[PDB]
Design a protein around this ligand. Sequence first.
Ligand SMILES: *[C@@H]1O[C@H](CO[C@@H]2O[C@@H](C)[C@@H](O)[C@@H](O)[C@@H]2O)[C@@H](O[C@@H]2O[C@H](CO)[C@@H](O[C@H]3O[C@H](CO)[C@@H](O)[C@H](O[C@H]4O[C@H](CO)[C@@H](O)[C@H](O)[C@@H]4O)[C@@H]3O)[C@H](O)[C@H]2NC(C)=O)[C@H](O)[C@H]1NC(C)=O
Ligand SMILES: *[C@@H]1O[C@H](CO[C@@H]2O[C@@H](C)[C@@H](O)[C@@H](O)[C@@H]2O)[C@@H](O[C@@H]2O[C@H](CO)[C@@H](O)[C@H](O)[C@H]2NC(C)=O)[C@H](O)[C@H]1NC(C)=O
Ligand SMILES: *[C@@H]1O[C@H](CO[C@@H]2O[C@@H](C)[C@@H](O)[C@@H](O)[C@@H]2O)[C@@H](O[C@@H]2O[C@H](CO)[C@@H](O)[C@H](O)[C@H]2NC(C)=O)[C@H](O)[C@H]1NC(C)=O
Ligand SMILES: COC(=O)c1c(CCCCC/C=C/CNc2c3c(nc4ccccc24)CCCC3)cccc1OC
Ligand SMILES: CC(=O)N[C@H]1[C@H]([C@H](O)[C@H](O)CO)O[C@@](O[C@@H]2[C@@H](O)[C@H](O)O[C@H](CO)[C@@H]2O)(C(=O)O)C[C@@H]1O
Ligand SMILES: *[C@@H]1O[C@H](CO)[C@@H](O)[C@H](O)[C@H]1NC(C)=O
Ligand SMILES: *[C@@H]1O[C@H](CO)[C@@H](O)[C@H](O)[C@H]1NC(C)=O
Ligand SMILES: *[C@@H]1O[C@H](CO)[C@@H](O)[C@H](O)[C@H]1NC(C)=O
Ligand SMILES: [Cl-]
Ligand SMILES: [Cl-]
Ligand SMILES: [Cl-]
Length: 527
Amino acid sequence: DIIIATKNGKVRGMQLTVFGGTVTAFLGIPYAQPPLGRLRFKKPQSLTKWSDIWNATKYANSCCQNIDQSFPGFHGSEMWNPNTDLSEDCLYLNVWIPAPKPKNATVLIWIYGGGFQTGTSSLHVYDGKFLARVERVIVVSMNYRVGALGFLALPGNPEAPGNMGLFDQQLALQWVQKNIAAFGGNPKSVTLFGESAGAASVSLHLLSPGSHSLFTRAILQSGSFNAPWAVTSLYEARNRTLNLAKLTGCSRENETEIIKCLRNKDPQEILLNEAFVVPYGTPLSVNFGPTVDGDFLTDMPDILLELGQFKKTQILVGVNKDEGTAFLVYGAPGFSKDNNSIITRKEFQEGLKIFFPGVSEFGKESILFHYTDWVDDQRPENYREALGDVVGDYNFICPALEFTKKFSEWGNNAFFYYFEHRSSKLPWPEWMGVMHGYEIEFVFGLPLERRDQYTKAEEILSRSIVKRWANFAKYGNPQETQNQSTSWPVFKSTEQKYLTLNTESTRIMTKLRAQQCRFWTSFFPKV
Ligand SMILES: *[C@@H]1O[C@H](CO[C@@H]2O[C@@H](C)[C@@H](O)[C@@H](O)[C@@H]2O)[C@@H](O[C@@H]2O[C@H](CO)[C@@H](O[C@H]3O[C@H](CO)[C@@H](O)[C@H](O[C@H]4O[C@H](CO)[C@@H](O)[C@H](O)[C@@H]4O)[C@@H]3O)[C@H](O)[C@H]2NC(C)=O)[C@H](O)[C@H]1NC(C)=O
Ligand SMILES: *[C@@H]1O[C@H](CO[C@@H]2O[C@@H](C)[C@@H](O)[C@@H](O)[C@@H]2O)[C@@H](O[C@@H]2O[C@H](CO)[C@@H](O)[C@H](O)[C@H]2NC(C)=O)[C@H](O)[C@H]1NC(C)=O
Ligand SMILES: *[C@@H]1O[C@H](CO[C@@H]2O[C@@H](C)[C@@H](O)[C@@H](O)[C@@H]2O)[C@@H](O[C@@H]2O[C@H](CO)[C@@H](O)[C@H](O)[C@H]2NC(C)=O)[C@H](O)[C@H]1NC(C)=O
Ligand SMILES: COC(=O)c1c(CCCCC/C=C/CNc2c3c(nc4ccccc24)CCCC3)cccc1OC
Ligand SMILES: CC(=O)N[C@H]1[C@H]([C@H](O)[C@H](O)CO)O[C@@](O[C@@H]2[C@@H](O)[C@H](O)O[C@H](CO)[C@@H]2O)(C(=O)O)C[C@@H]1O
Ligand SMILES: *[C@@H]1O[C@H](CO)[C@@H](O)[C@H](O)[C@H]1NC(C)=O
Ligand SMILES: *[C@@H]1O[C@H](CO)[C@@H](O)[C@H](O)[C@H]1NC(C)=O
Ligand SMILES: *[C@@H]1O[C@H](CO)[C@@H](O)[C@H](O)[C@H]1NC(C)=O
Ligand SMILES: [Cl-]
Ligand SMILES: [Cl-]
Ligand SMILES: [Cl-]
């Protein structure tokens, strides 16, 4: 057995037999007073000491959230749904310690995605026991409030200041600063990494002053704050908010007395009116997301980025080839995961009205023009594939490149990858390609378990990805030095070189999605 003494109490973990070795997991360590009762919506009060021995041998409650039900029984979607009881009592974290206890190990802190409305650290593909065993790092992950309960914003008023889930995250980075040396980790070598909404979170920690001391560098998988869905405005924030207030019938006008009303209301009621506070949602609507609150974020993050106001350090940034496809089957007409979704011109037209609901007629035609003077004509998948590229480029790929150009313009090393491998265990049909979020399992070293059906070449790709990620965390350079591996070159905004990840080739390419991103990041925003 193994007990570790933390700053506010003693915690017990369990031994995990992994790959002939042993990993020590501490699942479910509380890192804040439960945000309940008179504390719902408020920032996360810090946790008072205890005298027990905390039994941290199982994942804690997942935070309250709405569950995608568009594909009941289908692993490809249900893989992402929470796998622990949902409760407001839900601010806990997990620690994966290599056995035996390391001395001064690099710490990797994972932040999950979910459009700031969903997610949980318990997910199978966020299991860090593999990273602990193989590269001898410590892996930490935490639950943070999502949806309204985590991002409702009454700008100014502290019973709902906004950004609470981000402040949840931040106090957990604070926890590994005060406590991780007790686990054999090195609080001075912490790398944050996350995917999509998690990625935008960690790009926001690169901006938020209160986080600059709590980590060393950063890895942004398929997401960044300048993506169109990441930061909801301050006026559309509290327009979203008060729309909920009338739905719940909680409209006072002592601006504070609305909040007191939303706390004698039970969590399920709040969950079920979040969908309509944006009048015309899309598959990407962050109904309640990060806002400019003047505490975590003190100014519009695009300006902080444009004028070089962030933690100076190395970033590893990247995206997947078919980021957009996952969303077309969540709404778009003529699409389904059980056929090949060949849509005509007009099906595509009506599909832009769903991803661009408040965009002018001209704007929608503008997109149709850039994306359909074809490299040629026959192929009935033209509109099907154009629409997936439209969503992927606008929502993920071009924000991420634009983040990397602008970040690296202040002298820091940047590394850009481009993941283009489709898992063969992947259960979605083949026309959807390399989908949003399906690099995560390779990053976490799941293909290294041969017992769970992955190609041998898949396990090999996972093997260098993992090594590259770890060398980046520990040494700031994401190279694979030994096995005659392609060097990963630094991303300069001059030449814009990126590395491709797949089971055939590592290749160095240049100037990713050039023609498209010049449309997206300039001609298109003026409309
Ligand atoms: C936290 O966990 C520990 C151990 O859990 C371990 O976890 C997994 C991962 C593995 O490593 C396993 O080996 C472990 O299970 C818990 O420790 C248990 O503590 C209880 C305390 O009661 C033990 O129960 C028995 O203890 C005494 C021994 O003398 C008995 O006398 C007790 O029965 C008495 O109950 C009456 C009290 O009203 C008394 O009046 C009677 O005379 C009667 O004799 C009791 O049966 C238990 O044996 C321990 N576990 C093991 C495996 O031995 C710990 O409780 C956990 N804490 C939590 C969950 O909060
Ligand atoms: C800001 O809020 C108003 C009011 O919110 C409406 O009510 C909510 C419960 C929600 O379910 C939706 O009905 C609305 O968002 C919005 O005004 C609505 O606008 C739409 C068209 O945009 C119109 O059809 C509705 O009838 C309007 N409802 C009311 C009560 O006025 C408004 O659009 C929101 N956004 C902005 C930018 O102003
Ligand atoms: C691909 O599948 C979509 C899915 O719609 C189907 O609707 C059910 C009746 C049943 O057949 C299920 O397998 C699917 O969920 C098709 O979309 C429909 O198309 C018809 C006519 O084209 C139209 O009347 C429906 O309203 C459409 N429904 C939806 C949800 O889009 C689509 O036609 C299929 N395309 C190909 C090329 O196979
Ligand atoms: C960020 O993830 C979003 O989906 C998103 C939402 C999701 C909010 C509403 C739920 C709809 C489906 C959820 C299933 N959860 C999946 C996740 C991932 N990949 C999936 C791939 C296929 C099917 C389901 C997936 C990657 C990690 C997160 C969860 C709202 C607003 C913006 C968003 O993205 C900018
Ligand atoms: C409150 C919550 O969300 N989860 C509970 C958990 C279960 O989800 C619940 O019991 C429904 O099955 O139960 C927890 O533990 C119990 C002990 O607290 C109690 O003494 O009785 C059981 C003895 O083993 C049981 O262990 C748990 O299992 O962790 C508490 C947790 O918050
Ligand atoms: C851990 O490493 C830091 C430098 O990275 C060093 O200053 C510190 O003294 C070390 N402490 C332990 C306990 O290894
Ligand atoms: C009412 O509004 C005032 C002014 O913002 C505030 O001080 C007070 O706490 C609010 N609530 C009550 C119950 O007075
Ligand atoms: C490197 O190659 C050896 C065999 O020559 C293999 O056993 C090892 O796992 C490989 N490691 C990486 C990181 O590719
Ligand atoms: Cl045509
Ligand atoms: Cl037309
Ligand atoms: Cl253009």
